[PDB]
Amino acid sequence: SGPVPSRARVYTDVNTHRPREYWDYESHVVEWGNQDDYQLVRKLGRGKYSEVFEAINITNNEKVVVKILKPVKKKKIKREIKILENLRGGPNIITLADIVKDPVSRTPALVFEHVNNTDFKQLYQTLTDYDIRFYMYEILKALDYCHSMGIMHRDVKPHNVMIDHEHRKLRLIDWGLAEFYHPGQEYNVRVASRYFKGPELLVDYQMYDYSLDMWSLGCMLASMIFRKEPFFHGHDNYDQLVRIAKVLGTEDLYDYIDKYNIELDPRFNDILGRHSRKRWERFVHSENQHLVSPEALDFLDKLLRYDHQSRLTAREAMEHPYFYTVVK
């Protein structure tokens, strides 16, 4: 009875061996700056739970980005703030420059370093094979750092990866779904975009870890090197697993669910089917062949595995032959 437990292969006890104030974000006391330092220039995004603007810091004439926070639970304000403060200064981690609030409504706003992003739907089609390897290495620096600091991102995808291509400058943004990793903790599986959801989320395995970000990164890489957006095109959460099984095959899916004694939701019974494991070379075509190499396919093969434990860590990924041509 019950699923087999799992823990991260790396950085397992980072939070266990840190003081309570490091990870107990509900007790965090926010330090608030002066809202009047910042004036709004233009809207960048409007979700149900945030409004984001380009803004000017009128004290130093630098652009910043203002993220108005309106989450369903106020706990989540302190989670995003505490995680951003814990990770501040990490390689390729967006910098939280300030935290301000409306003196009247008390609506809080995060103030970030500005990145001169180009929408991925315009930028990615211009990147070369070296640019993808270079940007992927920058994201891996950010993920090995955040994992090393006890934090899972849980929302790795193009919309949360800012790139100022002119300055070869990448920042991993959007730490609002990020969580502190505690070995044995059962997490909400209702996290991440459907196309980037890992198999553990789809089969309701709650004892996941940093390895979830590595699957999300694999999905992002596959979409870039194959020019197939998204790579795993599910119509719903149940279909999403079927799209993954059409590539990775159903045999290895059953080895995964049996290793962890996972019970497959009955909704899978009639849509899963039976699928061979495909060769990654089947996804090469004239439009993408200039981005694909044996090293890229081997690297993708080692990220996109059902078993979260078997996936490369960020640091293992950084030592892969795909990044041999990338500085450090």
């Binding site: 809202q35 004036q39 409004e51 409306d102 706003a109």
Partner: peptide, 7 residues
């Protein structure tokens, strides 16, 4: 403006 900010 918006949430106490000026444009």
């Amino acid at each position: 403006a918006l949430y106490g900010f000026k444009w």
